[PDB]
Paper text:
This enzyme catalyzes the reversible phosphorolysis of 5´-deoxy-5´-methylthioadenosine (MTA) to free adenine and 5´-deoxy-5´-methythioribose-1-phosphate (MTR1P). The observed overall fold of SmMTAP is similar to that of members from NP-1 family of low-molecular weight purine nucleoside phosphorylases (PNP), which consist of a central β-sheet distorted barrel surrounded by α-helices, as observed in other MTAPs from human and bacteria.
SmMTAP structures displaying this SS bond also have the gate loop locked in open form. It remains to be characterized why there is a preference for the formation of such bonds in these mutants and the biological relevance (if any) of this SS bond. In general, residues 229–242, which comprise the catalytic residue D230 and the gate loop, are disordered in subunits without ligands. The presence of the mutation S12T does not alter the phosphate loop compared to the SmMTAP WT structures. Intriguingly, the results show an increase of 158X in the PO4 KM for the S12T mutant.
Author numbering:
A (entry chain B): 2 to 235, 240 to 291
B (entry chain C): 3 to 233, 242 to 291
C (entry chain A): 4 to 291
Write the structure that this text describes.
Amino acid sequence: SKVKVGIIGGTGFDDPNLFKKVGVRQVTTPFGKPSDTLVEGFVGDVACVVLPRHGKGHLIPPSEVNYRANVWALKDLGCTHILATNACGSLQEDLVPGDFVVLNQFMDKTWGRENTFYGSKPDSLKGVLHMPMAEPFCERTRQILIQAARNKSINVYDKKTMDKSACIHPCVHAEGSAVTINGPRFSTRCESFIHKAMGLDIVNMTLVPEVSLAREAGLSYASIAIVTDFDCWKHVCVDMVLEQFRKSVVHVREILLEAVALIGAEDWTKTIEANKALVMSSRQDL
Amino acid sequence: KVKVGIIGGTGFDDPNLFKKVGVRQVTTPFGKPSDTLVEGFVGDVACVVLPRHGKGHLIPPSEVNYRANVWALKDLGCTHILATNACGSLQEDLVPGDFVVLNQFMDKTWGRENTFYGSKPDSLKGVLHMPMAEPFCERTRQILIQAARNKSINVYDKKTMDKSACIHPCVHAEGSAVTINGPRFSTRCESFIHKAMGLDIVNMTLVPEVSLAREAGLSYASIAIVTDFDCCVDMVLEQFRKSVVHVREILLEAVALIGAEDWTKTIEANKALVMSSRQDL
Amino acid sequence: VKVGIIGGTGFDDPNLFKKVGVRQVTTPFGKPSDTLVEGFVGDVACVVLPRHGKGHLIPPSEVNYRANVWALKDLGCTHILATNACGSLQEDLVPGDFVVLNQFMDKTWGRENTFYGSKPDSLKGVLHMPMAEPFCERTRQILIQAARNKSINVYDKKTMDKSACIHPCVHAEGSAVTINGPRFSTRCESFIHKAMGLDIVNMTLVPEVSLAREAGLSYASIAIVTDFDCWKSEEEHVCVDMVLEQFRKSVVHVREILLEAVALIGAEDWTKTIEANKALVMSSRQDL
């Protein structure tokens, strides 16, 4: 019944100020060191832990982030949930810089990253885990993020029920799919055209394997993406984009803080049990 | 003189296809195979079995030593490899309980050792650019299909038969797999994309196994079992157990069919295709 | 200016110019594929590096692209011209043609594809480089004009009728899918790449083109269309002989184009283009 919310801060959250620090935790996991020390505290009455994905100084690129250590360390400190941010590029006309997206789907183009806790090697947990991922996020937690935005007077656009003419910017998109590329380079026009033609909404570099390991760890995970603009190469463009992005960070902070409180206002007993049981029923070695 | 190797996937972690005559606990220049190799006979035809995932199924797809498994079978004199693969369906006419004798694939694996050749000190020297347009041994595919006919299993050929002749459960006479790295299953977004590309099924173990078999100069063919990973479970599991029994029958008949023919020319062509693919020569 | 040349299949033993000397270098990312041939084309300094090393013993996935590009950068190169042998995916690109690529779709993995990271084997930092149009456009148009000056047909599908495609020709644009190799594609894979609208398939363009931009160098590639499906003909020995002889004629044409391209580069001023190549690197630093 104990609820505790971990937060993985991406670009723009390299040193977040979400709450007063009660504890600063330098932790080691069986999969190595996390990206930085973990800061533990309280939002209202809800215990919370925050970790910068890229470390202080933003020195670790997307492909070298130790996703296993970050997720394992949050589990180890008792987290039941993880809320994560990520900065992204738009692939579709209705997703414009300054919007947010509460993702529900992804296509994985990453490689070379440790993406599972289990295996046959000495540095892994014993066993073979095949997790279902058809809808890869925790749906309850997704809806918390969306309600938090409604609660903070931020426009919410749901393409599954609202006319396109009701898409008022800036807005939180209530659903969406990301293609996760490995980085560090951005896509060619050729690549972006194909990703767009496949119906993908945004592009990012950090969602996978973070979302996958959160599920393997029995935790409820949801991501909120900040749409920004990486195409100033076609002047003063960068300051306008960075001013919009600073505003985006303010609003996502309010969304995150309100989502933590909304998580604590509910019972999660059966959802946490289901999270843990799904890990156990996915063991193919038995 | 033929010798048939068998790589058993999920459902064949402990095959018992024949009375064990001998065991081979071996290693290779590319590391340890998945498990000890079990030697025997089907009729008069020599046969060797190894479970792809090891006994107890402790080895995930991306950590299987495909190089070592293929090399160990080659080292014992195998001329053929028959493999099983458990798969999910991407298309309406492939339903749980069916089988596919694959003839195509789309590779989305990474991080696996997938060639015996290169410039690293521990590789075989040379640059091997092997053709893979039709990646399986066609003679051996048709053996698997014929074996299913001889064991009273429906065969469906969508090139020549109307959809109304697709009577389940059936062996699909051709098909393409997307091979994903795993260990996780696909998102709905990924499945939708793979389906829209026209791929029939999804698997995690076919590649690089098929590629390395051709590098080794061996005739390779795969029979996939269609099951249902996203689902209830009691009916799926009992159905999968029935499919395992059917594949066992197909494999034992296939070994006998192989031994019944001469393979001298096909084997020599297997070996010459390796030679002619050496760009360093 | 100073032009580096990375020669692929068909350029293992380069004899482009009156060779001055051969040079062995080291880089912070290891040794390059081979020693380098230093010389001159007119007044312009030129260096040549066989991508696969002499003997062609290094396969595409094991090429040390970082060391090759950084070696050329450390020798003062401002430009890199690369050749790449490729297969066609579309009806109008036939063996013997050439392609001055302007786009790619990347299917490589497991190669060192960036100079920057948090590991000791890399430069300190996080570099996020724009790649929307991944080649140097001025250098692309140099290769094309060099083909015109050498009386090689040039075909621009945006502006020319396909029946007005005279072979052998230089296609003025084109997209590559770069597969990791070493095996060739299945029919299923080729069909999907074709359906995506890709023009040719190769194994060596990426990360070479990405690292050249990371290094602040102007990079353009001329692909050589050849034929990899001799296994389909009833007379494969004769097929490979004919394909090999046509490929030999192609490398003669490409040598002409490369030599003319080097002189065309040295004839222009590149002060602002080079400056822009450098500032793009700097501004792509997300840690700074």
